[PDB]
Every structure is written in structure tokens, then in C-alpha cells.
């Protein structure tokens, strides 16, 4: 339902000054997600815990094996701070920048992950597996993006990186 | 710095009509705790985790030994249910109607506990304990309140009521 792409070349700033005119800028978002693991290892027992602040918004995600449970948290800090003092250590931390853009029925994503790099999520709303990649196709070969195709989230490219 | 009495007589109701006309209604209040244990025992290691529900406002509290941390929470179920996945177990719970009234510098608190029964707490904001105790003399004699005295928590209460 998306393609997500590591772009070696151009720069995410080059390639966004191409599409400026033509795309409709939605927003850009600052995400951090921290990762904890109780002392029931989550790579034992497939859980996972998840603290995500997004634009100021505050998130606690539990995740079940292959469910979700979201409850909004007021303070980031304060909740990284609880689930500390219950004995949850810090697994992994993701920090993304991203910029959405708008054409058609696709959202664009220039994300940039620290110590990951640069990357370029796209989205359909309602569009086939191949509608989507006929609009990655045409898309890459307009901007000249030499790509790495991943369908790895940015934990697993994180823990892969590691 | 407050004064806590189980109410015997009257009831509580009675007392309410009595210092109606003379007290200021601050509010009501709809308050309940809710007690976890990790499988650490908080009876081990004086510790304690409490989700708070306050006539909608939902606040996650951490205690250290004898030290708070506090978060604010959209969902009082959700966050249960996340603490229940994570292997934490609810061990009290504690269901409280609160009516405020005040007069002068005090504040007086008609509280009726689920299991427990009835009580009034008197605060003072910036009394003397003396100042408190002439107050707690003079309001238990004028409303002829057969009482008991406890600096005992609501918690402390339902464990010692169990």
C-alpha cells in the first residue's frame, strides 16, 4: 500500500525544489519513537512498546504479536520517565523529519532519519499495487532518483543499521 | 494538615442540608484510583502506580519510597488495558463521590466511598493545626457529629477494610 525508497542521489532539498510548484505542501512533521523492552524480551515474545511524539502529540502504543492499544499521553518526558522507574529500559529511538506533498490521490514523504539518511515514502489512498508503482515509476525516472527499494520500517533499517 | 473523620451520624446528606445556606459550593467531584502491582511487589518495595480518573481527567502517577512523577492520559480503559499487557496487575481500586464546600479558609470534602461508607475531610489553606482543630471542634459540635478520627488513607482504609 506504499513503496518506500532510500535515495542515494539527488539530495531530498533537490529534489523537493523540483516538485514545489507542482505539488500541494501538506505539512512537515517532526516524529521521534522510542522503543523500551521489559527485564519478556519484545524480540523474544514479538511485543513491542512505543513512546511516538509527533508535531507535540504525545502517543503510548502497545503492539501484540502478528493489536494495537494507543492511548494519548500529555508529556513525552514524564512518560519515558514512569516507564523507567517500572524497570522498561530504551531499546531504540527513531528521529524523523518529514515533508508531505500532494498530487492526485498520493501522498509524498521526504523523510530524513538520523543515522539512517534520506528517504522517500509514497502513498496511495485508494490506487492498485499497480496503479502505485506505474506513479513510483514515472516519478523516479522524472526527478533521475537512484533509489533502494525497502519495504523495511525505519526500526527494523535502524536495528539492521546497528 | 487536613483532618479526616469517618461520619457515624448523621448521615452525610443531613449534614449537606445543614451547611448549605452558610458553605459556598465549590464542586463535585467523581474520582477513581486504581492500584497496580509488578510481578517487585509495591507492598515489597514501597512503591506504587495509580491511574486516576477525576470527573474525566485521567493522570498516571508513579510513587518512590519514602518522590511523584505524573502524566496526564486521554483514556482511563486504554491505559488499564496497556498496563494489563505489559504483565502489571490491578491490585485496589478505590471509587470516591466528593462534594466541596468552603467557608472561610477551609475546605470541606463530604466524601462517600464505595465498601467503606461515609467521611468528611477538612483542609485548611493557610491555618495553624490549632487554627484547623478549633475549626474541625466547632463544626463537629455544631452539626452534633459522632465521628472517627483517622489520618489513614482511602487505599490504607480499603487494604485495612479487606
Known amino acids: ?25 501538506i505539512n512537515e512533521e517532526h516524529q521521534i519513537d522510542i522503543y523500551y523492552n521489559n ?9 513491542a512498546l512505543r513512546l ?7 502517543i503510548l502504543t502497545y503492539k501484540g504479536p502478528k493489536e494495537e ?46 543515522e539512517l539518511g534520506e528517504f522517500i515514502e509514497i502513498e496511495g489512498i485508494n490506487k492498485t499495487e499497480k496503479e502505485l508503482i506505474s506513479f513510483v515509476d514515472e516519478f523516479v525516472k522524472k526527478h533521475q532518483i537512484q533509489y533502494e527499494k525497502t519495504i523495511k520500517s525505519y526500526l527494523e533499517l535502524l536495528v539492521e543499521h546497528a
Open 1 to 25: 500500500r506504499e513503496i518506500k525508497l532510500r535515495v542515494i542521489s539527488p539530495s531530498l532539498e533537490e529534489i523537493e525544489e523540483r516538485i514545489r510548484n507542482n505539488y500541494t505542501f
Open 39 to 47: 527485564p519478556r524480551d519484545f524480540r523474544k515474545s514479538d511485543e
Open 52 to 58: 511516538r511524539n509527533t508535531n507535540g502529540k504525545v
Open 69 to 114: 492499544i494507543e492511548v494519548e499521553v500529555s508529556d513525552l518526558h514524564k512518560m519515558d520517565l514512569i516507564l523507567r522507574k517500572l524497570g522498561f529500559i530504551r531499546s531504540f529511538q527513531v528521529e524523523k523529519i518529514r515533508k508531505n506533498y500532494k498530487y492526485a490521490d498520493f501522498i509524498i514523504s521526504l523523510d530524513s532519519i538520523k
